[PDB]
Design an enzyme around this catalytic site. Structure first.
Site, PDB file in Angstrom:
ATOM      1  N   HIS A  52      25.760 -65.828   5.602  1.00  0.00           N
ATOM      2  CA  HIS A  52      24.921 -65.689   5.157  1.00  0.00           C
ATOM      3  C   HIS A  52      24.235 -66.841   3.897  1.00  0.00           C
ATOM      4  CE1 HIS A  52      20.811 -63.201   4.021  1.00  0.00           C
ATOM      5  NE2 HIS A  52      20.056 -64.762   4.428  1.00  0.00           N
ATOM      6  N   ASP A  67      29.037 -60.839   9.269  1.00  0.00           N
ATOM      7  CA  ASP A  67      28.794 -61.223   8.040  1.00  0.00           C
ATOM      8  C   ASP A  67      30.132 -61.697   7.757  1.00  0.00           C
ATOM      9  OD1 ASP A  67      27.607 -63.039   6.448  1.00  0.00           O
ATOM     10  OD2 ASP A  67      26.506 -60.897   5.375  1.00  0.00           O
ATOM     11  N   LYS A 122      22.084 -42.747   8.849  1.00  0.00           N
ATOM     12  CA  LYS A 122      20.975 -41.882   8.174  1.00  0.00           C
ATOM     13  C   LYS A 122      19.659 -42.584   7.474  1.00  0.00           C
ATOM     14  CE  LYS A 122      23.368 -37.898   9.258  1.00  0.00           C
ATOM     15  NZ  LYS A 122      23.670 -38.801  10.965  1.00  0.00           N
ATOM     16  N   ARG A 123      20.371 -43.622   6.147  1.00  0.00           N
ATOM     17  CA  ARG A 123      19.595 -43.617   5.801  1.00  0.00           C
ATOM     18  C   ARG A 123      18.911 -45.448   6.046  1.00  0.00           C
ATOM     19  NH1 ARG A 123      19.339 -39.504   2.999  1.00  0.00           N
ATOM     20  NH2 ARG A 123      21.004 -39.260   1.206  1.00  0.00           N
ATOM     21  N   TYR A 124      19.795 -45.946   7.273  1.00  0.00           N
ATOM     22  CA  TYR A 124      19.218 -46.880   7.490  1.00  0.00           C
ATOM     23  C   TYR A 124      18.528 -47.360   8.793  1.00  0.00           C
ATOM     24  CZ  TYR A 124      20.532 -49.475   3.502  1.00  0.00           C
ATOM     25  OH  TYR A 124      20.211 -49.939   2.104  1.00  0.00           O
ATOM     26  N   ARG A 125      18.117 -45.894   9.693  1.00  0.00           N
ATOM     27  CA  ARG A 125      17.816 -45.891  11.046  1.00  0.00           C
ATOM     28  C   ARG A 125      17.280 -46.773  11.619  1.00  0.00           C
ATOM     29  NH1 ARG A 125      19.127 -40.762  11.987  1.00  0.00           N
ATOM     30  NH2 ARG A 125      18.749 -39.170  10.463  1.00  0.00           N
ATOM     31  N   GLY A 136      22.967 -62.522  -5.563  1.00  0.00           N
ATOM     32  CA  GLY A 136      23.232 -63.190  -6.499  1.00  0.00           C
ATOM     33  C   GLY A 136      25.186 -62.942  -6.626  1.00  0.00           C
ATOM     34  N   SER A 141      26.602 -61.421  -3.482  1.00  0.00           N
ATOM     35  CA  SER A 141      26.780 -61.657  -2.256  1.00  0.00           C
ATOM     36  C   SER A 141      27.812 -62.462  -2.134  1.00  0.00           C
ATOM     37  CB  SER A 141      25.339 -61.774  -0.423  1.00  0.00           C
ATOM     38  OG  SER A 141      24.620 -62.944  -0.889  1.00  0.00           O
ATOM     39  N   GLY A 142      28.708 -62.318  -0.650  1.00  0.00           N
ATOM     40  CA  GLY A 142      29.941 -62.761  -0.807  1.00  0.00           C
ATOM     41  C   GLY A 142      31.360 -62.796  -1.268  1.00  0.00           C
TER      42      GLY A 142
HETATM   43  C1  LIG Z   1      21.476 -67.264  -4.724  1.00  0.00           C
HETATM   44  N1  LIG Z   1      20.545 -66.719  -5.926  1.00  0.00           N
HETATM   45  C2  LIG Z   1      20.214 -67.174  -6.923  1.00  0.00           C
HETATM   46  N2  LIG Z   1      18.466 -66.572  -7.412  1.00  0.00           N
HETATM   47  C3  LIG Z   1      18.962 -65.617  -5.813  1.00  0.00           C
HETATM   48  C4  LIG Z   1      19.684 -65.591  -4.886  1.00  0.00           C
HETATM   49  C5  LIG Z   1      19.576 -64.723  -3.687  1.00  0.00           C
HETATM   50  C6  LIG Z   1      18.882 -64.217  -2.912  1.00  0.00           C
HETATM   51  N3  LIG Z   1      19.394 -63.663  -2.040  1.00  0.00           N
HETATM   52  N4  LIG Z   1      20.793 -63.621  -2.337  1.00  0.00           N
HETATM   53  C7  LIG Z   1      21.631 -63.352  -1.365  1.00  0.00           C
HETATM   54  C8  LIG Z   1      21.371 -63.857   0.134  1.00  0.00           C
HETATM   55  C9  LIG Z   1      21.438 -65.222   0.034  1.00  0.00           C
HETATM   56  C10 LIG Z   1      22.644 -66.263  -0.415  1.00  0.00           C
HETATM   57  C11 LIG Z   1      21.669 -66.196   1.200  1.00  0.00           C
HETATM   58  C12 LIG Z   1      22.081 -62.197  -1.260  1.00  0.00           C
HETATM   59  C13 LIG Z   1      21.561 -60.951  -0.409  1.00  0.00           C
HETATM   60  C14 LIG Z   1      21.124 -60.055  -0.199  1.00  0.00           C
HETATM   61  C15 LIG Z   1      21.748 -59.230  -0.820  1.00  0.00           C
HETATM   62  C16 LIG Z   1      22.134 -57.801  -1.249  1.00  0.00           C
HETATM   63  C17 LIG Z   1      20.917 -56.564  -1.854  1.00  0.00           C
HETATM   64  N5  LIG Z   1      20.351 -57.607  -1.638  1.00  0.00           N
HETATM   65  C18 LIG Z   1      18.682 -56.276  -1.305  1.00  0.00           C
HETATM   66  N6  LIG Z   1      17.723 -56.903  -2.108  1.00  0.00           N
HETATM   67  N7  LIG Z   1      18.344 -57.899  -3.155  1.00  0.00           N
HETATM   68  N8  LIG Z   1      19.566 -58.191  -3.135  1.00  0.00           N
HETATM   69  C19 LIG Z   1      21.646 -54.904  -1.781  1.00  0.00           C
HETATM   70  C20 LIG Z   1      23.107 -54.572  -1.602  1.00  0.00           C
HETATM   71  C21 LIG Z   1      23.564 -55.582  -1.150  1.00  0.00           C
HETATM   72 CL1  LIG Z   1      25.804 -55.036  -1.120  1.00  0.00          CL
HETATM   73  C22 LIG Z   1      23.590 -56.669  -1.064  1.00  0.00           C
HETATM   74  F1  LIG Z   1      24.078 -57.614  -1.348  1.00  0.00           F
HETATM   75  C23 LIG Z   1      22.751 -59.670  -2.202  1.00  0.00           C
HETATM   76  N9  LIG Z   1      22.505 -61.018  -2.545  1.00  0.00           N
HETATM   77  O1  LIG Z   1      22.949 -62.355  -3.524  1.00  0.00           O
HETATM   78  C24 LIG Z   1      21.105 -64.667  -3.411  1.00  0.00           C
END
Ligand SMILES: Cn1cncc1-c1cnn([C@H](CC2CC2)c2ccc(-c3c(-n4cnnn4)ccc(Cl)c3F)c[n+]2[O-])c1
Length: 236
Positions: free
Chosen positions: A44, A93, A160-163, A186, A188-189
């Site tokens: 992603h 992902d 159950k949390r993500y139906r 920020g 993710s990855g």
């Molecule tokens: C880089 N940047 C600079 N300014 C903001 C970002 C930014 C905004 N989205 N992203 C990324 C997706 C984007 C890279 C393609 C993202 C999305 C979701 C979650 C997340 C969440 N979240 C749910 N709602 N928010 N986070 C909850 C749990 C878990 Cl395990 C997660 F991985 C974490 N990231 O990193 C980064």
């Protein structure tokens, strides 16, 4: 990272910060060193990335403020996204970055092992999520790498949390029932790293969740053990 604390230099040496440079340079995603020329991260992350030309991989970074115009980075030779990836919440992902040269491993840049063959029925009880992401839903990228210990959740409880989603065996969920500690924007990855017999394993890739650290809404991670064959095929 919500509810986390600052890391110290050298603490998570497989953690990298992936930067984009278009239209300006900024942290895009986390990632993990898994080989001298290989980073494992989330597919992603590359939404809207026009080509690998604009990416920079920085290793050995504690504070984002350390990165200046003469800071060395690795170029990215290839982005390998799983062929079935469509959107984070649907799975697959996962992405490999092939670097343009080999990392020489040092105290500050080290590989993390993949989950080991014969360990599929191990119960991981020492798992950590790390990153420079938000400390709350509307926050900002953090300067200092943060860490939080988070417990794994069964796939039955997670479903159950993500139906409204299909939680599959290729996902792993992590979080406290009461919330308070989680990945956020920020992170993710980056890695979900679990220590077993004093060896760290890359168990998850930070992927998605409903909000950040909300009660009864665990974070969802790519279940790396289910992609080992894919990783080995691509890296060989
Ligand atoms: C880089 N940047 C600079 N300014 C903001 C970002 C930014 C905004 N989205 N992203 C990324 C997706 C984007 C890279 C393609 C993202 C999305 C979701 C979650 C997340 C969440 N979240 C749910 N709602 N928010 N986070 C909850 C749990 C878990 Cl395990 C997660 F991985 C974490 N990231 O990193 C980064």
């Amino acid at each position: 990272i919500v509810g986390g604390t600052a890391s110290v230099r050298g603490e998570w040496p497989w953690q990298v910060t992936l930067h984009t440079t278009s239209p300006t340079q900024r942290h895009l995603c986390g990632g993990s060193i898994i080989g001298n020329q290989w980073i494992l991260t989330a597919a992603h992350c590359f939404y809207g990335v026009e080509s690998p030309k604009i990416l920079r991989v920085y290793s050995g970074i504690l504070n984002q403020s350390e990165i200046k115009e003469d800071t060395s980075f690795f170029g990215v030779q290839e982005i390998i996204i799983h062929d079935q990836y469509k959107m984070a919440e649907s799975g697959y992902d996962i992405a490999l970055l092939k670097l343009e040269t080999t990392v020489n491993y040092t105290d500050s840049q080290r590989p993390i092992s993949l989950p080991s063959k014969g360990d599929r029925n191990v119960i991981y009880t020492d798992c950590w999520v790390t990153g420079w992401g938000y400390r709350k839903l509307r926050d900002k990228i953090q300067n200092t790498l943060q860490k939080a210990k988070i417990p794994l959740v069964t796939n039955e409880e997670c479903q159950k949390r993500y139906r409204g989603h299909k939680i599959t065996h290729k996902m792993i969920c992590a979080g406290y029932r009461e919330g308070g500690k989680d990945a956020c924007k920020g992170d993710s990855g980056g890695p979900l790293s679990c220590k077993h017999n004093e060896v760290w394993h890359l168990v998850g890739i930070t992927s998605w969740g409903e909000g950040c650290a909300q009660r009864e809404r665990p974070g969802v991670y790519t279940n790396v053990v289910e992609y080992v064959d894919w990783i080995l095929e691509k890296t060989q």
